[PDB]
Amino acid sequence: SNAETVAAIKTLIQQLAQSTDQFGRAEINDALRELQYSLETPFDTVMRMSLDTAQVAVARIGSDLGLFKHLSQCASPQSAEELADHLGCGRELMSRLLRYMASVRMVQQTDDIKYISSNITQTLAVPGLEAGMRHAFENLWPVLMALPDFLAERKYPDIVDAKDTAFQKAFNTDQDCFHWLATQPTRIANFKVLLTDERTPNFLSTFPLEKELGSWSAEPEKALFVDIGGGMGHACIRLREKYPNQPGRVILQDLPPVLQAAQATLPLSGIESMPHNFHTPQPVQGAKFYFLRLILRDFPDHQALEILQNIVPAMDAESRIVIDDGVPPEKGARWAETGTDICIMSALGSKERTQRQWEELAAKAGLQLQALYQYTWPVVNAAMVFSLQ
Amino acid sequence: SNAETVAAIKTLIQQLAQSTDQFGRAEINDALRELQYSLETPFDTVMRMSLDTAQVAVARIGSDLGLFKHLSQCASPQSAEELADHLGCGRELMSRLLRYMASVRMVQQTDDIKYISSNITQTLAVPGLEAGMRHAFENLWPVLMALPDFLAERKYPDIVDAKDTAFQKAFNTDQDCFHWLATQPTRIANFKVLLTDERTPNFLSTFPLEKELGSWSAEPEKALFVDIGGGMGHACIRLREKYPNQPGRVILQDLPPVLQAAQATLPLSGIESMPHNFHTPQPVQGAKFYFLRLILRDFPDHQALEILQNIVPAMDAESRIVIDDGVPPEKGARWAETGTDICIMSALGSKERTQRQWEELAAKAGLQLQALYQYTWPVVNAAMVFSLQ
Amino acid sequence: SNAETVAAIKTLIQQLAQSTDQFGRAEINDALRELQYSLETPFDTVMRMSLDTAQVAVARIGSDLGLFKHLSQCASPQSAEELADHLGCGRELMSRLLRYMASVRMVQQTDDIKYISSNITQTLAVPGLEAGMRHAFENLWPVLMALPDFLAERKYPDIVDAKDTAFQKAFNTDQDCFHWLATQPTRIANFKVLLTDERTPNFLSTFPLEKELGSWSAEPEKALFVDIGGGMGHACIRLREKYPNQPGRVILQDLPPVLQAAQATLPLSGIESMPHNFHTPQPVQGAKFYFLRLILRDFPDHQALEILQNIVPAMDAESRIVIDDGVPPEKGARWAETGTDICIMSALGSKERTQRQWEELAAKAGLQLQALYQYTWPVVNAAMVFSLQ
Amino acid sequence: SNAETVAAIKTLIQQLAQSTDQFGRAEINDALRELQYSLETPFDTVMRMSLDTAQVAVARIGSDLGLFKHLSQCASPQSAEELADHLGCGRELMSRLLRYMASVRMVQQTDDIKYISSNITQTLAVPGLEAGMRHAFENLWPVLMALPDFLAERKYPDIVDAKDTAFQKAFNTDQDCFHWLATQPTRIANFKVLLTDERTPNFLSTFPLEKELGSWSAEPEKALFVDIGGGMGHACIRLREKYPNQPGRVILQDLPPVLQAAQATLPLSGIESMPHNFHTPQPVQGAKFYFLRLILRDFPDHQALEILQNIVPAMDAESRIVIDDGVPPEKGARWAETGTDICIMSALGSKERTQRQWEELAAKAGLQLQALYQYTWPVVNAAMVFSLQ
Numbered sequence A, B, C, D: 001s002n003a004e005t006v007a008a009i010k011t012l013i014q015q016l017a018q019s020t021d022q023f024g025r026a027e028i029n030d031a032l033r034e035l036q037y038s039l040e041t042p043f044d045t046v047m048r049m050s051l052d053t054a055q056v057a058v059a060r061i062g063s064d065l066g067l068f069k070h071l072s073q074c075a076s077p078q079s080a081e082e083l084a085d086h087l088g089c090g091r092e093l094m095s096r097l098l099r100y101m102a103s104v105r106m107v108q109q110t111d112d113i114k115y116i117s118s119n120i121t122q123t124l125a126v127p128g129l130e131a132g133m134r135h136a137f138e139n140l141w142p143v144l145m146a147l148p149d150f151l152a153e154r155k156y157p158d159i160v161d162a163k164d165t166a167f168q169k170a171f172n173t174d175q176d177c178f179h180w181l182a183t184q185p186t187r188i189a190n191f192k193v194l195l196t197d198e199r200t201p202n203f204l205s206t207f208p209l210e211k212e213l214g215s216w217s218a219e220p221e222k223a224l225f226v227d228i229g230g231g232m233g234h235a236c237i238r239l240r241e242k243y244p245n246q247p248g249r250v251i252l253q254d255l256p257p258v259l260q261a262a263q264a265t266l267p268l269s270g271i272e273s274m275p276h277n278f279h280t281p282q283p284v285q286g287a288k289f290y291f292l293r294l295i296l297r298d299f300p301d302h303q304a305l306e307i308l309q310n311i312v313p314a315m316d317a318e319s320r321i322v323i324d325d326g327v328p329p330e331k332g333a334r335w336a337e338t339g340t341d342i343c344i345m346s347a348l349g350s351k352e353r354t355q356r357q358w359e360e361l362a363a364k365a366g367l368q369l370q371a372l373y374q375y376t377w378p379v380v381n382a383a384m385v386f387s388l389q
C-alpha cells in the first residue's frame, strides 16, 4: 500500500526529528528539500517554481485579513463560511484561499472541511514574524523581479555599490535602499515591528565570556559591552541575564527613534541607552567588547570598513570587536546563506562573507581574528573576536 | 552522527522511491514537503517564504545567459571563471549565482568548486520547460504581486470575470489577459515554445476507446476525433499511434499560427489541420469525440459555457464531448491543484473545478456525464465523457 | 547498493533505539525478530532452526576455556594464535570457534582478523550471566531434547505433576527436578552463582509503598517486609535503600547455604537473615508484606497452593501477600513468556500464569487481589497484592 | 507512540525487502539479526540463548502430531480445542504449544485466539524441509550437546578425523557417522526424504556453459555431464531443462538404493542412471564435466582428496572437475557458513573451505582452478572449475 508507506515515512522522520536537537532537525529539513528536488519530474520542477511563489502573496492576504491571528485564537474548527463572515471576505474567495492554505500547511483542513491553526498559522500570527513575511513581499519581491532585466540591460556587471543595484530600478529612484526607506512611513512601521523578533539561539550559548574576559577589570568605571546598532537591545538583555554578576557598563547604541521604541522593554537599570550613529567615531573608550550583530552584512566592503575604522581608535590593547554574523563555508553553502547573499546583493549591494573574507575586511581596519565561536548549524552564525594587529 | 543519520534517510527514501511508479513517487514527494513544513522552526518558515522566491529570478537569469543549455552539453566540470568568460557574465556575479544555484540543485557543485549539470539543469535546458519557467516569471509573478492590494482595495470580492481580476492592475490595462497577450510579440513567442512540451502520461493510458466506440461507424466520411484547441496536436498523434487501424477522420483544430507551427512535427498523413476559433460554431458535424484538453480551466463559467454551446449543436446522439482536465477532490486537494486555482483566478478569472462543478457547468449546456477516466494520481487529471441530455 | 541500504537500515534503527527507553528497545527488538521470521526463505527457516542451537554449545566451550573473561580484560585485539596458546586450545580449533563466535557477535573480528570483546563477550564474562548460559546448556537442553519423545510415548498428556514430566526421562530418575539437583554438587554451585544476578528494573519502581502502607504501624516489633525465598536479598537491599526511614523489620528468608552466601553483600544492619523452608508454616506473624518473587512459577498449582497455605495462617487483616512474577496476557504473548512456559513445563511441571490464573490460584488459598502494579513491558512482570478474602 | 514507531519500522523494512531480490533480502535479514544482538540487554542475551533452543523441540512435536500439514490445509482459523481434538493432543498441552508457536511465528494467532498457518507453517509442512528440521533434532543436537565435554576431556584437540570427533561420544560408537547411519533404518528414512528437497537458486543461473564448453564435441558418443553422488538427479534434470539442445551423455551416479528412489521422478530419456561408489575409480572416460555438488564438504582432506584422485585418471585435456560447494570468505564469514563448519566438524570431522583451501586441496590431486562462478550471496555457493595441471 503506497498510502501505508507514505504514512510510515512520516512516522519515522517525525520520530528521528524528535530524537535530535534543533540543529539536527535543520539538517533533516535540508535533506528533505534535497530529496524532493532530486525526485521531482522535470514537469514538477517547473510546476514547483511556478507555484511556490503564490505562498507569499497568500500569506500577505491572510495577514491583511487578520486570518492567522483569528484562527490561532479559535477553540474549535471553523468553516470557510464562518471565517468569511467574521473577517469580511467574499465566501467563494475565502473558501478558495483556505483550500490553498491547507494544501501548503498555512492552516489545517479537517475531515469535515473545517479549518484549524497549524504551526505556520501560529507563526504568522506573531507580529515580528508576520512583519518578516510582509517585508519579503513588499521589499524583497520587487528587487528580485527587477534583477534579471537590470543585469541584462547592464551586461551582467559585478554589483559592488549600494547606489547601483536592482533596488534603483525596482523603486525608480537614485537613492540607496536605506536612504529611500527612511522616507516611506508604512515601510518604516513594518521594520519597527520586525525589530521585535529575537533570533534563537544567540551567541551567548557558546561564547566563552569568562575566558575572553581574562583578567580585564571593570574598575574604575569601564564598559564591558557596547551593542552597536543594537536595535531593541536583545543582546544586552540576554548578556545581563546570563552574566548578572559581571561588572562593567552595558551600553545599547542605536538611533534615537529606535532607542525610544526599546525603552518599554529594557530593564529599569543596568543597561544604558546611548544615541550613536555608527558612521561616526565610537564615543565609548576602552570597552572590553564592541559588538556588531548582523550589521556589516548590510554594507559593501567600503562602507563596512568605515564602520570598523570608526571603532578602532576607541580600542585599547584589551578591547575586542565582536562581529556576530553569517559565516558561510568556502563550498557547499546552503540555500539560506546563498539566498540571503543574492537578496542583499540586489537590494543593498552587499554580500555574505566567508571567514577568509571577514578576515580580509578586518585586516584593512588593522584588526586580526583571535577566535571564532559558532552558535548555529548547519547554516553558520558565529561570534568572531578581533583584536588590534 | 547527524551526517550519518541524514545520509541514511536519503538512502532509504531513494530506494523506496525507485521501487514504486511515478504516482507513488509523487505521493512521496508530497509527504516530504509536508514533513518539511511541519518540522521547520517559525523563523525558518519566514526564511523559506522570503527566499524560495529567488529561484525563479535566478533561473530567469540562467536562461538569459544560456547557462543551462551550455552546462547540459559540457563534458567536464566547469569553473565559475570559465562559465563567466564563455557566457559574458561578470566573474564575481557568476560565482555568486552558481553558488546559489548549487544550493538549490539548479546545478551541482563539485568538491573542487567546479560545476556540472544536475537533473534540474537538464530540465531548464529543454525549450518547452524553460518556457514554462519564463512564463512564471513574466506572466504569473506580476499578477501574484498585484493580487493582495487588488483584493484589499476592492474589499475582497469573489473574482468571477476575466476582465476584472488582478491582471488588469498588474499590467495597467482594461483588456483581459488573453487579448492583451496577443498584442505582445515576445510573450507570444514564449507561448509557442511552451506548446512543444507534451505532458505524460496522457488520457489514452486509461481511456477504453473500444468500449466507448461500441458499434460506431465512420461510413460517411465522419470524424472519430476533433481536437479543439489541440495545439501541436499531441493528442491526435498519440491516438493515431495507439489505434492506427481505427477508421474515422482525426482533426486538429487551432488558430492558424499554431497550426503552422504544428506542421513540422505532424505525420504526413492521417491528421487533418483545420483552422477554427473555438469561440465560434463547431464546423465538424456528428463527430464521435469532440476533445477539449486543458481548455476550459482557462475560462470563467460564462465563457466556458459558451465554448461548449458552440459544440453542442454539431452533436448527434452518438457524439461525445470529452473534457480532459483537472478534477480536484472535494477535500484534501494538493498544492499543485490549489496553487493553479489561485494563479488562474488572478490572471484569468477562472478556476479549477471538482467533478461536481464540471457536471454543473456541462448541465447548463444540456450535457450529462457518462463516464470519467482518471489517468494521473494523486493530482487527478481525467477524461470526462459527456453526452446530450 | 545492497550494502548501502543495509547500512542505512542499521543507522536508522540504532538512532530510533537510542531515542527510546529500555521498554521501547525491547519492543523494537521483538519487531526485528518478527521481521526476520517473516522475510526468511523456507530453506533459511530450516537453516536457522538447525544452526542457532550451536550458539549455546559454543558459549559453553568459551566459558570452559575462560575465553570471554580473558577477552573482556584485553587492551588490544588478539590473534587466534595468541588466544589458543594462552587458553590451551588447539590453534585450528580456536580459529574456527572464533570465526563462528564473530559471526554471531559473541566476539568481534577486526579487519586484520584479530579479535576483541563485543557486548556479548562482556555479558558472558559476568559470573551470574555466564551461569545462566551454563544452566541452559546443562539443565534446559536435556529436558527439551527429551520432551518430544516423552510426549509421543505418553500420547500427549497435559503435564501437571513435577514428578511426571520430561525431566525424569532426561536424567533417568524418579526424583523431581529440585530434589535431584540438590544431590548434584556441580549444578548446585552454578545455581549459587546464578543468584548473584539482579534483574532490573524491579518492583519498587512502580510500587506505591506509602499508599499500600496507609496508617500501618510497626509498634510491637512487627515486620514490614518478609522476603520468602529471597536469595541474595536484593529486594530487601533495594527496599532499605529506597525507604531508609520507614520503620518495621525487613527479613530475608531462605535456606541456610543461600543465607550464608548472602552475608558478604548484605548491609551490616537493617536486614535480618532468617533460615526458613517455604514448604513449612511461616514463623513471622502479622507482617505487612509477605513477598514471593519468581517463586511460584516454579511449582504446579498443588505445590504453589501449599506454599501460600503455609503463609495465610500468619496473616492478620492488614497483612498482604505480594506475588512478584510474570503476568502473560490472555493473547499475543511474547517469546520470552511462552518459551519460559514450555521450559518450566518440561523441567518442573509448572507454568506461566495469566492474571486470571493467578487470581484463581490465590482464591484457593482464601486470598483476593487488591492491586496489580506492572513494572516491565512488553513482557509483563508485576507485583500482585493479595489480602485475606 | 512506540507502537506506531514499531509498526512503521515493519512497514518500511517490508517495503525495502520487496524492492530487492532474494540476495538483497538475505542481506537485510542478516542485518536484522545483527541489530537484535547489538540492541538486546545482557539479560536478554542469555534469555535468547536459553530459549531459542526450544523452537526445534516444539517443531519436532508439531511434526509428530501432523499439525503443520493439517493447519496448512485449513480454510478458516482453528481453535486450540478443535486442533487438539483433531490431532489427538491434550487440550491444555495443545493450547500452550500453540501459544508458543504463535510467539515465534511457527503459526499465527488471530484476534479471537484462533490459529492460522504462517509462512513457517507451510515450510514445515513440506516433506523435504520438515526432514531437515527432524535431522537437526535427531542428528545435529546430540553431537552439539556432546561437543563441549568431548573437547574438555581431550584437552581441546584440533579435530581432523571422522572416526575421532564428537559423534562417537554422542552416539556411543566407534564407527564414523556415515557408517553408523547406514545401520539405523529410521534415520535412513529421514535422509531419503531430505534428498527430495531441491535448493534454489542453482549453479546454472550463472554458469556460462557455452563458454566453458568451447569447441568440445560430443561426437562420437562422449559424456557432457557426470553427476557424482547426484542424489535424485536435480542437477541433471535442470541441466537438460536449461540446455535441451546440447548433445552429450548426462549421467547420474549414486548408490543403488538412491538411484531406485530417483527413478520415479527422472525423465523417461536423456539421463542415465549409473550405480557408482565415488570411493572407486571413475568409470566414465573423458567427460566434459565431472560434477561434485555438496559432496566434498562432508569429508576431511584425506578422504576428499581420495575422491578427487579417483576422478583425475578419467580426465582428458578438455575434461573439467566442477566442485559446487560453499566458499566462505577469508574474513567476515556469516553464521550460516561458520555454523555449518562447527556442525560438520563435530559430526563428520570435516570443514568448510575458503577458495584458497579448495585450491590447496585440488592441487594435491594435480588440479588447477580455471574459473569460479558464484551463484548465491551473501553466503557464497559457487561452481569452481578445475582442469589438469
Ligand SMILES: C/C=C/C=C/CCC[C@H](C)C(=O)c1c(O)c(-c2ccccc2)c[nH]c1=O
Pocket: A043, A046, A047, A048, A050, A051, B128, B129, B131, B132, B133, B139, B140, B177, B197, B297, B298, B339, B340, B343, B344, B347, B348
Ligand atoms: C512546462 C509547464 C509547467 C507548468 C506548471 C504549472 C503551471 C501553473 C500555471 C498557473 C497554470 O497552470 C496556467 C497558467 O499559468 C495559465 C496562464 C496563461 C496566460 C497567462 C497567465 C496564466 C493558464 N492556465 C494554466 O493552467
Ligand SMILES: C/C=C/C=C/CCC[C@H](C)C(=O)c1c(O)c(-c2ccccc2)c[nH]c1=O
Pocket: A128, A129, A132, A133, A139, A140, A177, A197, A297, A298, A339, A340, A343, A344, A347, A348, B043, B046, B047, B050, B051
Ligand atoms: C523574521 C525574519 C525572517 C527573515 C528571514 C530571511 C531574511 C532574508 C533577507 C534577504 C535578509 O536576510 C536581509 C534583508 O532582507 C535586508 C533588507 C533590508 C532592507 C531592504 C531590503 C532588504 C537586509 N539584510 C538582510 O539580511
Ligand SMILES: C/C=C/C=C/CCC[C@H](C)C(=O)c1c(O)c(-c2ccccc2)c[nH]c1=O
Pocket: C043, C046, C047, C050, C051, D128, D129, D132, D133, D139, D140, D177, D197, D297, D298, D339, D340, D343, D344, D347, D348
Ligand atoms: C532442508 C535442509 C536444510 C538445512 C540447512 C542447514 C543444514 C546444516 C547442517 C549442519 C549441514 O549443512 C550438514 C549436515 O548436517 C551434515 C550431516 C550429515 C549426517 C549427520 C550429521 C550431519 C552433513 N553435511 C552438511 O552440510
Ligand SMILES: C/C=C/C=C/CCC[C@H](C)C(=O)c1c(O)c(-c2ccccc2)c[nH]c1=O
Pocket: C128, C129, C131, C132, C133, C139, C140, C177, C197, C297, C298, C339, C340, C343, C344, C347, C348, D043, D046, D047, D048, D050, D051
Ligand atoms: C541470567 C539468567 C537468564 C535467564 C533467562 C531465561 C531463563 C529461562 C528459564 C527457562 C527459566 O526462566 C526458569 C528455569 O530454567 C528454571 C529451572 C530451574 C531448575 C532446573 C531447570 C529449570 C526455573 N524457573 C525458570 O523460570
Ligand SMILES: Nc1ncnc2c1ncn2[C@@H]1O[C@H](CSCC[C@H](N)C(=O)O)[C@@H](O)[C@H]1O
Pocket: A195, A228, A229, A230, A231, A232, A233, A234, A235, A253, A254, A255, A258, A276, A277, A278, A279, A292, A293, A294, A295
Ligand atoms: N547609522 C546608524 N547608526 C546606528 N544604528 C543604525 C544606523 N543605521 C541603522 N542602524 C540600526 O542598526 C540595526 C540593524 S537591525 C538590528 C540588529 C541588532 N544588532 C540585533 O541583532 O538585534 C537597527 O536597529 C537600526 O536602527
Ligand SMILES: Nc1ncnc2c1ncn2[C@@H]1O[C@H](CSCC[C@H](N)C(=O)O)[C@@H](O)[C@H]1O
Pocket: B195, B228, B229, B230, B231, B232, B233, B234, B235, B253, B254, B255, B258, B276, B277, B278, B279, B292, B293, B294, B295
Ligand atoms: N480562440 C481559440 N480558438 C482555437 N484555439 C485557441 C483559441 N484560443 C487559444 N487557443 C489554443 O488553445 C490551446 C491552449 S493550450 C494547448 C492545449 C492542448 N489541448 C493540449 O493539451 O495539448 C493553444 O494551442 C491555443 O493556441
Ligand SMILES: Nc1ncnc2c1ncn2[C@@H]1O[C@H](CSCC[C@H](N)C(=O)O)[C@@H](O)[C@H]1O
Pocket: C195, C228, C229, C230, C231, C232, C233, C234, C235, C253, C254, C255, C258, C276, C277, C278, C279, C292, C293, C294, C295
Ligand atoms: N524450600 C525452600 N525454602 C526457602 N527457599 C527456597 C526453597 N527452595 C528454594 N528456595 C530459594 O528460592 C529461591 C529461588 S530463585 C531466587 C528468587 C528471589 N526471590 C529473587 O527474585 O531475587 C532461591 O534463593 C532458593 O534458594
Ligand SMILES: Nc1ncnc2c1ncn2[C@@H]1O[C@H](CSCC[C@H](N)C(=O)O)[C@@H](O)[C@H]1O
Pocket: D195, D228, D229, D230, D231, D232, D233, D234, D235, D253, D254, D255, D258, D276, D277, D278, D279, D292, D293, D294, D295
Ligand atoms: N560412496 C558413495 N558413492 C556414491 N554416492 C554416495 C556415496 N556416499 C554417499 N553418496 C551420495 O552422495 C549424496 C550426498 S547428498 C546429495 C548431493 C547432490 N550432489 C545434490 O546436490 O543434489 C547422496 O545422494 C548419497 O547417496
Ligand SMILES: [Cl-]
Pocket: A242, A243, A244, A245, A246
Ligand atoms: Cl556572572
Ligand SMILES: [Cl-]
Pocket: A329, A330, A331, A332, A333, B099
Ligand atoms: Cl558554496
Ligand SMILES: [Cl-]
Pocket: A043, B199, B200, B201
Ligand atoms: Cl503532467
Ligand SMILES: [Cl-]
Pocket: B204, B205, B206, B207, B208, B209
Ligand atoms: Cl485502455
Ligand SMILES: [Cl-]
Pocket: C199, C200, C201, D043
Ligand atoms: Cl528482567
Ligand SMILES: [Cl-]
Pocket: C204, C205, C206, C207, C208, C209
Ligand atoms: Cl512509586
Ligand SMILES: [Cl-]
Pocket: D242, D243, D244, D245, D246
Ligand atoms: Cl541448449
Ligand SMILES: [Cl-]
Pocket: C099, D329, D330, D331, D332, D333
Ligand atoms: Cl571469518
